[PDB]
Amino acid sequence: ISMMGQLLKPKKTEITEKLRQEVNKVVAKYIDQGVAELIPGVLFIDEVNMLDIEIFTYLNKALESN
Amino acid sequence: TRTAAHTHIKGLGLDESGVAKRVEGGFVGQIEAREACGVIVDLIKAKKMSGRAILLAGGPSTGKTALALAISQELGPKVPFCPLVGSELYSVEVKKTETLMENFRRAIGLRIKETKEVYEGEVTELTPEDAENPLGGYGKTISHVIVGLKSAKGTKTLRLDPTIYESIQREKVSIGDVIYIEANTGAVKRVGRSDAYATEFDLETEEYVPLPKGEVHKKKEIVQDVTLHDLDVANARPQGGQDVISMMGQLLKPKKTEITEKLRQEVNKVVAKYIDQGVAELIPGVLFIDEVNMLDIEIFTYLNKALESNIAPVVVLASNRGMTTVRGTEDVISPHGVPPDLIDRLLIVRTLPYDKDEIRTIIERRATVERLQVESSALDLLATMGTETSLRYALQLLAPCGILAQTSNRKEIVVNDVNEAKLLFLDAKRSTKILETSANYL
Amino acid sequence: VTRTAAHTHIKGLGLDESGVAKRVEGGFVGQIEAREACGVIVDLIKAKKMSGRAILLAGGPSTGKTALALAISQELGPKVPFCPLVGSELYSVEVKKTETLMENFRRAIGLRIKETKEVYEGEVTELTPEDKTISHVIVGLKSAKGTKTLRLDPTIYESIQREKVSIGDVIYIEANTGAVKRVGRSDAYATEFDLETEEYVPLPKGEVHKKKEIVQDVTLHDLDVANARPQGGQDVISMMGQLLKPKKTEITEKLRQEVNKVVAKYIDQGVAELIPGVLFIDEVNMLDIEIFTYLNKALESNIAPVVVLASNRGMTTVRGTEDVISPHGVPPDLIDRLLIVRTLPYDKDEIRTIIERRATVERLQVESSALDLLATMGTETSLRYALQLLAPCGILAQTSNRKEIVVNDVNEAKLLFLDAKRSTKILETSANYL
Amino acid sequence: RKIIDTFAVLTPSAVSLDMRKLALGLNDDSSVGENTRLKVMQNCFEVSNPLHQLQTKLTIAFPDKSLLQYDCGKLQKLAILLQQLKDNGHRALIFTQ
Amino acid sequence: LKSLSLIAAHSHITGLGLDENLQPRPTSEGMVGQLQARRAAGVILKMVQNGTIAGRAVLVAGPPSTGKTALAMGVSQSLGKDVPFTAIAGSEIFSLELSKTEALTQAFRKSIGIKIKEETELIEGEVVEIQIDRSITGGHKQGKLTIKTTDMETIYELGNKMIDGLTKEKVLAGDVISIDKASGKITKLGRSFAFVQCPEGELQKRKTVVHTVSLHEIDVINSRTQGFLALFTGDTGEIRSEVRDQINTKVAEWKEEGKAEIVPGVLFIDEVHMLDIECFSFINRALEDEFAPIVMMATNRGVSKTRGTNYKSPHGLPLDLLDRSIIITTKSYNEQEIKTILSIRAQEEEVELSSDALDLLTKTGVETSLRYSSNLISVAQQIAMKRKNNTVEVEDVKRAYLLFLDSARSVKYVQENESQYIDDQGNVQISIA
Amino acid sequence: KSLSLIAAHSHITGLGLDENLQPRPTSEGMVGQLQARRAAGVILKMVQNGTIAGRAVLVAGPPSTGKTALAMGVSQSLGKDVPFTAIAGSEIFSLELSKTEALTQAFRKSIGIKIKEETELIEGEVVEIQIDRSITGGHKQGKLTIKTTDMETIYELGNKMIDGLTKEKVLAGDVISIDKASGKITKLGRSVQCPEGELQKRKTVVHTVSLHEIDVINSRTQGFLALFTGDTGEIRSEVRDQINTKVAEWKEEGKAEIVPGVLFIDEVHMLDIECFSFINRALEDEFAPIVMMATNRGVSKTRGTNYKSPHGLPLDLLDRSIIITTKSYNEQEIKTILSIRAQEEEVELSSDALDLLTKTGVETSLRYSSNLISVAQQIAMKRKNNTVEVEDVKRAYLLFLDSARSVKYVQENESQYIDDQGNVQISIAK
Numbered sequence A: 001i002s003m004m005g006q007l008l009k010p011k012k013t014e015i016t017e018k019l020r021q022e023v024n025k026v027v028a029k030y031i032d033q034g035v036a037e038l039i040p041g042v043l044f045i046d047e048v049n050m051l052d053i054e055i056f057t058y059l060n061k062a063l064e065s066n
Numbered sequence B: 001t002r003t004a005a006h007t008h009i010k011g012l013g014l015d016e017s018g019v020a021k022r023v024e025g026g027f028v029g030q031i032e033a034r035e036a037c038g039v040i041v042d043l044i045k046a047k048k049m050s051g052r053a054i055l056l057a058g059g060p061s062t063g064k065t066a067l068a069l070a071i072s073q074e075l076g077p078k079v080p081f082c083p084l085v086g087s088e089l090y091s092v093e094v095k096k097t098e099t100l101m102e103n104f105r106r107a108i109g110l111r112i113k114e115t116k117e118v119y120e121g122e123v124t125e126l127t128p129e130d131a132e133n134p135l136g137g138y139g140k141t142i143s144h145v146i147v148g149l150k151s152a153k154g155t156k157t158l159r160l161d162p163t164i165y166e167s168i169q170r171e172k173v174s175i176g177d178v179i180y181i182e183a184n185t186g187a188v189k190r191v192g193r194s195d196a197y198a199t200e201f202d203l204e205t206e207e208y209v210p211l212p213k214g215e216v217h218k219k220k221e222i223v224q225d226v227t228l229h230d231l232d233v234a235n236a237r238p239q240g241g242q243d244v245i246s247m248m249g250q251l252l253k254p255k256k257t258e259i260t261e262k263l264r265q266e267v268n269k270v271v272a273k274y275i276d277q278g279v280a281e282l283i284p285g286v287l288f289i290d291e292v293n294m295l296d297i298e299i300f301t302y303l304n305k306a307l308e309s310n311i312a313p314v315v316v317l318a319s320n321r322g323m324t325t326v327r328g329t330e331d332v333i334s335p336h337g338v339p340p341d342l343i344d345r346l347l348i349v350r351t352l353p354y355d356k357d358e359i360r361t362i363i364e365r366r367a368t369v370e371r372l373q374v375e376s377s378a379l380d381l382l383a384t385m386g387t388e389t390s391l392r393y394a395l396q397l398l399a400p401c402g403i404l405a406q407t408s409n410r411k412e413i414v415v416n417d418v419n420e421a422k423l424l425f426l427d428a429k430r431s432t433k434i435l436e437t438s439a440n441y442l
Numbered sequence C: 001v002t003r004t005a006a007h008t009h010i011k012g013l014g015l016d017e018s019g020v021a022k023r024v025e026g027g028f029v030g031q032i033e034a035r036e037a038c039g040v041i042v043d044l045i046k047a048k049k050m051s052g053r054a055i056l057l058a059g060g061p062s063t064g065k066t067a068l069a070l071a072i073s074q075e076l077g078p079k080v081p082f083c084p085l086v087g088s089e090l091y092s093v094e095v096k097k098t099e100t101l102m103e104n105f106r107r108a109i110g111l112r113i114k115e116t117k118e119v120y121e122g123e124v125t126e127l128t129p130e131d132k133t134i135s136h137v138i139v140g141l142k143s144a145k146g147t148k149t150l151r152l153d154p155t156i157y158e159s160i161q162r163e164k165v166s167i168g169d170v171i172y173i174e175a176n177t178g179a180v181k182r183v184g185r186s187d188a189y190a191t192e193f194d195l196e197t198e199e200y201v202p203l204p205k206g207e208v209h210k211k212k213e214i215v216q217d218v219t220l221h222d223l224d225v226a227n228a229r230p231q232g233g234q235d236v237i238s239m240m241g242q243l244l245k246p247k248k249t250e251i252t253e254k255l256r257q258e259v260n261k262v263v264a265k266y267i268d269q270g271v272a273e274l275i276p277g278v279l280f281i282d283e284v285n286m287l288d289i290e291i292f293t294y295l296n297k298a299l300e301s302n303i304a305p306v307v308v309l310a311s312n313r314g315m316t317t318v319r320g321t322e323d324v325i326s327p328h329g330v331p332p333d334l335i336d337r338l339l340i341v342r343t344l345p346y347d348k349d350e351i352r353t354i355i356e357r358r359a360t361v362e363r364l365q366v367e368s369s370a371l372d373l374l375a376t377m378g379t380e381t382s383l384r385y386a387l388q389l390l391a392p393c394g395i396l397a398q399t400s401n402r403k404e405i406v407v408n409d410v411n412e413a414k415l416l417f418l419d420a421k422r423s424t425k426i427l428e429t430s431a432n433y434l
Numbered sequence D: 001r002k003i004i005d006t007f008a009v010l011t012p013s014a015v016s017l018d019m020r021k022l023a024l025g026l027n028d029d030s031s032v033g034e035n036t037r038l039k040v041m042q043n044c045f046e047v048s049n050p051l052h053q054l055q056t057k058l059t060i061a062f063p064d065k066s067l068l069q070y071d072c073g074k075l076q077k078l079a080i081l082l083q084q085l086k087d088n089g090h091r092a093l094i095f096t097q
Numbered sequence E: 001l002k003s004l005s006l007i008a009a010h011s012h013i014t015g016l017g018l019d020e021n022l023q024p025r026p027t028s029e030g031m032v033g034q035l036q037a038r039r040a041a042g043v044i045l046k047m048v049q050n051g052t053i054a055g056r057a058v059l060v061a062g063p064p065s066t067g068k069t070a071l072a073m074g075v076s077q078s079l080g081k082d083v084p085f086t087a088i089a090g091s092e093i094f095s096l097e098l099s100k101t102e103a104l105t106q107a108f109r110k111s112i113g114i115k116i117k118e119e120t121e122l123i124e125g126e127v128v129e130i131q132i133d134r135s136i137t138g139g140h141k142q143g144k145l146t147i148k149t150t151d152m153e154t155i156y157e158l159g160n161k162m163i164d165g166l167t168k169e170k171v172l173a174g175d176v177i178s179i180d181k182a183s184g185k186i187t188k189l190g191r192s193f194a195f196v197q198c199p200e201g202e203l204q205k206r207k208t209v210v211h212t213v214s215l216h217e218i219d220v221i222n223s224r225t226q227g228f229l230a231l232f233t234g235d236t237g238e239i240r241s242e243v244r245d246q247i248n249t250k251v252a253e254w255k256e257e258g259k260a261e262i263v264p265g266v267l268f269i270d271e272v273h274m275l276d277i278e279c280f281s282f283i284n285r286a287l288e289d290e291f292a293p294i295v296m297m298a299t300n301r302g303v304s305k306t307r308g309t310n311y312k313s314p315h316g317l318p319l320d321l322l323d324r325s326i327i328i329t330t331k332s333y334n335e336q337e338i339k340t341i342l343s344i345r346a347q348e349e350e351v352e353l354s355s356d357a358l359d360l361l362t363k364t365g366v367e368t369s370l371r372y373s374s375n376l377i378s379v380a381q382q383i384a385m386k387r388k389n390n391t392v393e394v395e396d397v398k399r400a401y402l403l404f405l406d407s408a409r410s411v412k413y414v415q416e417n418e419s420q421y422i423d424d425q426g427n428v429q430i431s432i433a
Numbered sequence F: 001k002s003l004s005l006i007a008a009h010s011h012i013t014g015l016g017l018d019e020n021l022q023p024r025p026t027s028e029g030m031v032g033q034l035q036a037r038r039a040a041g042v043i044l045k046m047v048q049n050g051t052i053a054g055r056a057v058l059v060a061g062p063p064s065t066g067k068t069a070l071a072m073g074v075s076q077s078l079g080k081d082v083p084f085t086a087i088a089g090s091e092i093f094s095l096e097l098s099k100t101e102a103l104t105q106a107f108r109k110s111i112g113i114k115i116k117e118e119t120e121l122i123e124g125e126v127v128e129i130q131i132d133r134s135i136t137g138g139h140k141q142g143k144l145t146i147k148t149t150d151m152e153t154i155y156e157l158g159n160k161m162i163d164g165l166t167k168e169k170v171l172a173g174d175v176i177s178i179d180k181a182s183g184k185i186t187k188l189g190r191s192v193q194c195p196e197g198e199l200q201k202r203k204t205v206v207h208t209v210s211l212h213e214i215d216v217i218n219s220r221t222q223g224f225l226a227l228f229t230g231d232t233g234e235i236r237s238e239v240r241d242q243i244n245t246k247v248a249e250w251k252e253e254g255k256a257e258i259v260p261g262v263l264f265i266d267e268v269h270m271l272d273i274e275c276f277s278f279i280n281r282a283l284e285d286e287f288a289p290i291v292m293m294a295t296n297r298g299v300s301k302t303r304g305t306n307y308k309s310p311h312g313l314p315l316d317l318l319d320r321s322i323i324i325t326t327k328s329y330n331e332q333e334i335k336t337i338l339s340i341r342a343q344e345e346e347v348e349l350s351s352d353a354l355d356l357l358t359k360t361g362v363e364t365s366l367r368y369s370s371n372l373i374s375v376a377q378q379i380a381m382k383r384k385n386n387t388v389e390v391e392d393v394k395r396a397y398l399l400f401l402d403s404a405r406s407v408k409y410v411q412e413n414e415s416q417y418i419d420d421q422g423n424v425q426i427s428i429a430k
């Protein structure tokens, strides 16, 4: 079954917030242990006028995240 | 002990074949409406009609959904009842028509009753009975098998045909272990070792079951119910452990598919064949749809077609709109948003707004339900507020007054608490006035 | 006995060797110039010299345009592939319309190929596996005229063991595709059991190994999708492969180019012969602007076959365009690549002859007065109305036991069934949108 | 089984062998391990499927048996007359060259 | 025999009610009135029974509550079994998974059936003795059984598969068993003495079995190896046209060889007034093929706008189909006809009606819609049940009428209280003060 | 090879130019459009240079006036081993792939990578092969003899090649090739061919692979199958970043070189505004093939927007691009083009017939005459005369209509045809 799944094409899926929370928890534990270091990045979007109003609205909620 | 805008409705509040009382079953006023609802309840309980549609229309907060909840309660848990919303039908996975047909089939139920004769108890001994073979031969011949069963307040030994040898060998049950045997179907089923043998070992991976109570021979009747949609989905969906389709269901995503009509008609045929023997008993249900004004015109047409089916159950529709345009057509204007042809196929039940005294009675009954006590002056003020702004606003305001009284260590609400609630909590009209009077985009 | 559906009264264009169209020939009347042009197109198709030609025929409703489109295919013969299609069919949920159009293009052109196959059959004498991995098996195939032993691929071993065969069962195995199928137990063991479900078959005639030549025809798109996706096969592996991706997918141009290259290689050896076909699209006005835009480039392809189009519309706006108006709903940048064949309405005598022929193929007898009344009705409302009303007159004659159509029967048919004009007249004066 | 056997006719006229193994990713040379692919083929060998009947029917067009009386014009009109003589209680003689 | 049946709208209609002269009777087979429409329907039914023609499309018209759907149901009932009949709605073809053209093609294919018959020998008798010779951890096993009829009695020796066949299901001497030799199926006809008489005549007899399967099932089966499951789950998409062409050729040659016969059916589309222009354009060409079932179309709309186009077309359909279709119109109902319809509905529901009650119901169904009374009858009977009398009176019907509103009365009440209800603009008044 | 019957651009092959980039009046099937031809040659030399990438060039002109012919000639003159992608605008609208993803895949398909690998192999006629089973003395002993024109010797088989040779049936006397590094067996035929010399020789194999193919291969367990089935499905961006970095390292190491091919998009005017906005950014990155576009329409409404834009494209994209304009053909050019087309189709035309055809083409269109040339030939062998006369041309002209004549007839007889509102008349009388 795992080989069959590997054969199938990788389709994007809505990753749940719970999985991101668990990843955040383990990353925070590791960075507290000093085994890893977190480096913030930069996201650049060009021609933002092409965005829909829904994406504009969700940007407000996204920008307030930790 | 949780309530949400409901649970204070206990039946339709009717009487024994007559006009419903003034106050009964948490219902006040609208005697004609619940009388008609009781008539509909009798009609569905008759279980003879098919595809009977009724529609109730009225203003907001007039107990439109309350009446549906009441008829659902009156019908009973055994009768199927499927609540639904107008927005339910719009499904990405499959077309709307298939979802509506699936809900229709889910509305109809079916009950199965069976009786079984059970011989159970601890295995005292297993001794074959020898007899002369009908055909000459030197081999051993067995005519019967003797099995002894021991139970609480009774033990017995049974003489059975020797064909039970295969089943007793398969079940891997030897001595002092509780077994189950059906009278006519035969065969045996091991259920676990006798509890008396538990101490025989320091450790054990096998559970020990207590001996059956009562006589070894039992006669229990079992009743099981299931809706038609469950039968259809079980027939369509494959099952199995290692057949290729079994884990083809795995490594993929099972999704709703348009079930063919041939499968449905085959299920109907087998159900009819079983019900002709008296084992089955079909019971129609009720399908409840809210905000039916939100249905598409195509869905309305399919509803018109489906209501003439021979298996379509009773459906009940609710709408709080009047002279509006049906969605999907910019020019067609019909009452309540239902196309005129569909309206021609059903019956309209009116609903009337309540009065000040009825509002006060509703508020006091809700307060009794919420387990909090109000004063007469506070109750009158709340009734006046409800008659002024709306009934639902007054109903929602109840809990904040209780909280405010709790903060002041008081057990009963006073005028000051309701004033604090009114200044802290706003209704629709004041909010609209604030929006009109403010230019900060609020 | 025989079924007739608005057609089958036409057997061909019925033209002369000089291209002159007879007045009445092959279930046709009139439209001499259109039939001559269609015969010219047929000759061009048979030439096979040039590919990518695009013609369309424009005319009013019930002008025989689809009749001409069927007649050309009938004249071309079953050997030349012909792909009927409707404009609405291009809109597919599974894949984009462009892929469907290109797939139809590939389906239009055919190919004839010849090949030889090796066939083994006989009664089984032994199953000896050669045993981490699935071992080969030695089979003791035995016929009435010979006997030999063969070694089989482990996939074939799995397939034959899935057939649940044993000793003494006659089996059939294809050496090329590996197909395995057991006809049944040999006739020698017929009396082994007095009651057994398994049927018995006689010993195969001839030796075990046989060869034959087959010239079966396969379209280009068929082998295209054969290379694109896996197909049937008795092994479980084939089932897994063809169940992994059941939904169809668009084919890239790389696979098409490789298919063209291998087809050219096949035709170099003379094994294969190429036969271009004709693609027919009806109600072309139903297509969108993007479909026409892609068709502009598709027609310029070197391998694109000849496509015929049909439309009945005047000054109309092209679908997907808010303001573009062009004849027959075809954008102006496409009509330049097209050749337009005009079609003209018929006359009273032509309508009468058409009705006569339609009655003859329908195995019915019509009196002179009834025929004249039918012709007058056709000239009065529509040609199709008489053809539709023909059958009810026959039914009425059957009910009255008479063997011919009279004026009373056709009058009753008129009373019972209404045309579009009478229905519209009723609609204009109606109570509630009758 | 009977309906499937009687009503399955068409075959995938164009096929390309050895493409199935490549599509499933298992063959002599691939990015998978030899032992893993061997286990995969072993499992496919020992896994039973109920679609084998349809697989065989579609893969190869079996000539069947009833076609014997269907491919001969004389045989087409012979069974009817044999049945008719059977109902009338008449015996028949057949002579061949 | 009888499938799941409940009293529905068209339960009473069973057949057209036509004579040998195709002249409808005034009241027969649940059909009342509409003499010309019924005669036309009978003509169409005779044409379908003839089966010598194809690709004929007939459109029925008329205002709502006229009986066009009832006429089609009567046509289906008079058609009888063994002839396929498909009834679909207009909005049914709007599939999210399947193309509309593909859905229409599937609907067209479903209406044509195919009959194939074969002879299967049968052996049926009473069991006398069953003897199975097995070996524990031995493998090979043997078996012998004795069968019996009224005239003859012999012992049969079983094969290896027969041992499994008789051991999977319990078979004793007291059982009456029929087994198909070629098929291998084992059937338990009944239980003799441990109450069914022993089979008479010859032990082995040959019987003919015919399988009827619609052509669309053949397309689905031959589309893919796993397509058989789609015959039940309905999950099939975009069957290749080459499959359809090959199936058509196979069917034609089978009919030519006489191995199988085709049974053309009737495709019925309800509320065709709503559909897309693509569907009409596809139908225009689909009706011209050889394997085209006769199509009946129903539409109660007037001169309206076809979906997918801005312009308004007469009868709700573009003129292309109207040119190639046959129109049957239907007229309104007389008061006496409404009375007879109500009486036949009551007889169907075995509800006793007072003469005065019937007259007032007829008058109110003349004033209002017929369906209003045809629904009010059951509620009136239910109300009368509470009075412990098995007869509906005038008072019961009046109480039902005042209990349940008609469309016009509800419209009047809404207009008088437009503030209470929700306006189209969204405004609504809920405060009593 | 490269089977093809007849194409509208089959006659033109390789454009036409001189060492000074001066177009000839007639060179390799190209007539007229001197300025356009010189600009196309400039663009071709720019592409062959490879120093400058990510530039946009636009082709504009009236319909049927040397627009797709220019691109075809540019592609032909560019030759093989250079990527060239020609896709219609409507092709990017895919139901299973985003328009941005399809555009990115098209961009990546136009940059080809050449990689060189050196392998050793032996080949020749095989005369003797012996294989033995395991004994305690030796696990497997196998000797084979391969004879060439110059050499014939025996090698020793160490188990693995014994298994490889036994995997497929091999008979002595046939030409085979053995790759020592890969360990695979290749059969070159039977001794039909002849050997040449030494068994083992030194050679390198060069593979031309586009960036898109590399991404698809690295994006899945078996990605190379998606090269043909087209189910790539929105390859992840980090995969592309990794591929870009690896390609940069390979180029700096000399293991591979890049070929900046050409991307040609036709009917760009109907592309959506989002596609243009994405192209704006995609043209400014490092790896970007040259982009050429051709739009027939002028001053129309951009799809996806309400306002009308000049040339059917947004202004910023026009700023990002360079515009090349083609001129309408002339009679002396039209006659030469028709003669070339007739030569390509092997049709003999009389002088008067050619003059009449040129007059008709000037009157109506060039495509009408270039289609009439073929159809007149069917009448020609209908009269059994190889040469085409004026009578055949006139018969074809009257038989097959033109756009203007059809429009005029429709205007005269609009009653018979279906109106926009749906009104139509079928009955003749009344």
Ligand SMILES: Nc1ncnc2c1ncn2[C@@H]1O[C@H](COP(=O)(O)OP(=O)(O)O)[C@@H](O)[C@H]1O
Binding pocket: B005, B006, B026, B027, B028, B029, B058, B059, B060, B061, B062, B063, B064, B065, B066, B318, B320, B362
């Ligand atoms: N007779 C009654 N007794 C008590 N509460 C009632 C009664 N009728 C209506 N209600 C209240 O009205 C609410 C139902 O509102 P409803 O009219 O269904 O809303 P809508 O008009 O949006 O359907 C319930 O929460 C219930 O508390």
Ligand SMILES: Nc1ncnc2c1ncn2[C@@H]1O[C@H](COP(=O)(O)OP(=O)(O)O)[C@@H](O)[C@H]1O
Binding pocket: C006, C007, C027, C028, C029, C030, C031, C060, C061, C062, C063, C064, C065, C066, C067, C068, C312, C354
């Ligand atoms: N010359 C003819 N001979 C016989 N039948 C004809 C002729 N011309 C037209 N018809 C009939 O007219 C009908 C309409 O023609 P067709 O091209 O199929 O559809 P339409 O012209 O409406 O698009 C056809 O069914 C055909 O039988």
Ligand SMILES: Nc1ncnc2c1ncn2[C@@H]1O[C@H](COP(=O)(O)OP(=O)(O)O)[C@@H](O)[C@H]1O
Binding pocket: E009, E010, E013, E030, E031, E032, E033, E034, E063, E064, E065, E066, E067, E068, E069, E070, E071, E300, E341, E370, E371
């Ligand atoms: N001749 C008839 N016999 C019996 N019932 C009829 C007749 N005519 C009309 N009806 C009734 O009128 C109702 C509406 O007719 P129908 O054609 O089914 O739908 P509609 O006409 O509203 O589209 C049906 O329920 C049917 O029972």
Ligand SMILES: Nc1ncnc2c1ncn2[C@@H]1O[C@H](COP(=O)(O)OP(=O)(O)O)[C@@H](O)[C@H]1O
Binding pocket: C333, F008, F009, F012, F029, F030, F031, F032, F033, F061, F062, F063, F064, F065, F066, F067, F068, F069, F294, F296, F337, F370
């Ligand atoms: N210079 C030329 N030499 C020969 N043929 C040409 C030339 N220019 C255009 N053509 C002809 O014009 C056709 C291409 O038309 P084109 O101008 O590309 O249309 P559009 O302008 O709509 O893209 C080709 O079939 C070709 O035969």
Ligand SMILES: [Mg+2]
Binding pocket: B064, B065, B066, B290
């Ligand atoms: Mg509600």
Ligand SMILES: [Mg+2]
Binding pocket: C062, C065, C066, C067
């Ligand atoms: Mg036509």
Ligand SMILES: [Mg+2]
Binding pocket: E065, E067, E068, E069, E070
């Ligand atoms: Mg109806």
Ligand SMILES: [Mg+2]
Binding pocket: F064, F067, F068, F069
């Ligand atoms: Mg061009």
